[PDB]
């Protein structure tokens with residue numbers, strides 16, 4: 001574990017991702033992803049070990065320890081220098097894909113603030129990821145373009161004038177651009193409306209998946225599925241428009257259940273807080289259920305004195321990889337449920353004692 | 363059937379019972395019952411045919427065709443002069459009990475407006491019943507005492523100084539009084555509260571039963587314990603509990619209207635859709651649907667339909683009345699076809 005690997009696996013929620021983005025009650029994050037390949041180098045499907053090593057080596061040489069103004073310094077993490085639990089944490093923080101952990105010459109060039117993650121030797125040689133809190137696809141696209149320009153200064157992209165950027169996936173040819181949004185939709189699930197919505201979203205060339213990428217914790221990721229022939233601007237508007245609708249529909253449904261079944265909803269969310277604050281065993285499944293309830297309670301003003309950032313942190317912190325990393329070494333499922341309960345209840349008791357004791361001074 | 367029998371079985375809802383009584387959205391009727399026996403005559407349990415027969419002859423001789431000022435003329439109906447479906451209609455109109463239909467010398471002295479029904483030779487020699495629309499136990503008690511005095515002018519009641527009126531059932535001894543209200547409680551049923559309410563009412567010396575003895579969300583609440591209680595205590599025990607149920611059912615009604623407005627409009631209008639368009643319908647579904655539509659009228663969701671029309675259908679679609687109205691016995695399947703047609707026509711009639 002290098003000092004920079006420790007830096008990226010240490011915190012479940014980066015300071016970058018703790019910032020308040022627009023519509024952050026419904027949209028947790030926005031992701032922009034640009035795929036490219038080296039000109040004259042065979043796509044990862046048919047390239048040699050030597051080729052893959054050169055891609056990583058060229059990045060360590062020209063981009064490691066280098067900087068972009070306004071984004072910060074970039075550090076290169078090689079998958080081969082990371083223990084299995086270290087790699088899982090990077091997955092659970094949404095910094096790398098699961099498939100990157102299986103790539104023998106996989107690596108990722110990460111900005112120190114964790115806003116930019118350039119995956120190397122995944123499905124394409126280069127996958128630039130920009131991750132913003134809340135709803136900011138245009139802002140994420142700008143950062144993506146800065147990193148893209150930065151890399152193209154020293155890398156010649158597989159490009160042709162009639163097809164655009166050449167990618168391994170034939171559908172991906174063109175912009176290499178994929179946009180996804182992470183959304184918390186507890187009211188649309190609760191009111192039994194989401195299963196009549198998802199089929200409509202899939203009609204618009206988008207795809208809906210759970211947090212992993214079933215929808216535990218009522219968290220849904222909506223991303224571009226069809227991009228062949230679309231411009232960058234069309235790709236981002238196709239997702240933006242659907243997300244903005246979902247923001248409105250999820251808000252209306254929250255206001256609806258709050259107005260019609262106020263006490264039942266308070267009972268639901270405080271009972272879930274009750275579980276999190278007193279349980280001695282809890283699985284990931286139930287944790288996700290309860291965290292969703294409490295987050296809905298916070299958003300509606302029912303659950304008081306608890307910030308949403310604590311909940312975002314626990315959603316990552318209670319994942320099985322991160323929980324084992326944080327506890328030091330692998331753990332049986334039963335042991336995890338005991339450690340998870342202790343971590344959640346202690347983190348929660350801590351947040352209500354700060355809120356008790358700093359509020360008391362005033 | 364005699365001209366007086368035909369009169370009492372012709373209409374499902376008497377003009378008397380169409381009057382708007384107090385709290386009539388929740389309380390359909392109030393009933394007062396005074397039981398008495400002839401002095402020197404054995405209780406129906408051990409009385410002889412000659413004895414039983416004398417009791418009804420005396421009522422024919424002194425009360426048949428006689429009148430009470432402010433109530434109207436009375437007429438005697440003998441159970442042995444009535445066909446079984448005719449007897450069934452009277453049970454379904456709540457004028458007599460089922461046990462009276464099996465009593466060979468049973469009879470009932472009925473006021474022509476159907477406000478008073480004096481059963482003869484049932485569980486006691488005399489059972490004075492007064493039935494009022496809505497929630498008016500006290501007015502029913504006044505009318506009951508008026509009928510009681512009238513009979514006592516010519517009948518010596520079996521009475522003792524330590525015990526009160528002597529009745530066959532030893533726990534009715536004393537006043538011979540039993541009070542009842544028939545209540546429509548759909549919201550407390552929908553909101554799954556009635557089962558936590560009924561056990562509590564049963565604790566207060568009351569009993570809760572179905573429509574004739576809980577289809578259609580209709581509950582009959584009666585005095586269960588009367589021994590040692592005064593008349594005043596018997597009537598107030600039921601009145602206060604009933605008055606609480608009125609408020610609790612009204613609060614639950616307003617509550618669900620506010621919590622699930624369109625779902626409630628959907629439920630009651632779909633039940634109206636069934637009633638106005640079905641070609642087959644059983645007693646069970648009819649009562650289910652009439653309850654929904656009645657709730658809709660009460661909350662203002664369903665307009666242009668009077669609750670009196672619904673009360674009439676609730677009786678009119680009963681299996682006995684349906685067969686009487688159709689002129690003869692009916693297979694259950696045939697009843698379901700004629701019931702649907704009957705409901706459909708009354709409803710189409712009222713919406714023009």
Ligand SMILES: [Mg+2]
Nearest residue numbers: 145148149152
């Ligand atoms: Mg570019």
Ligand SMILES: [Mg+2]
Nearest residue numbers: 507510511514
């Ligand atoms: Mg008297």
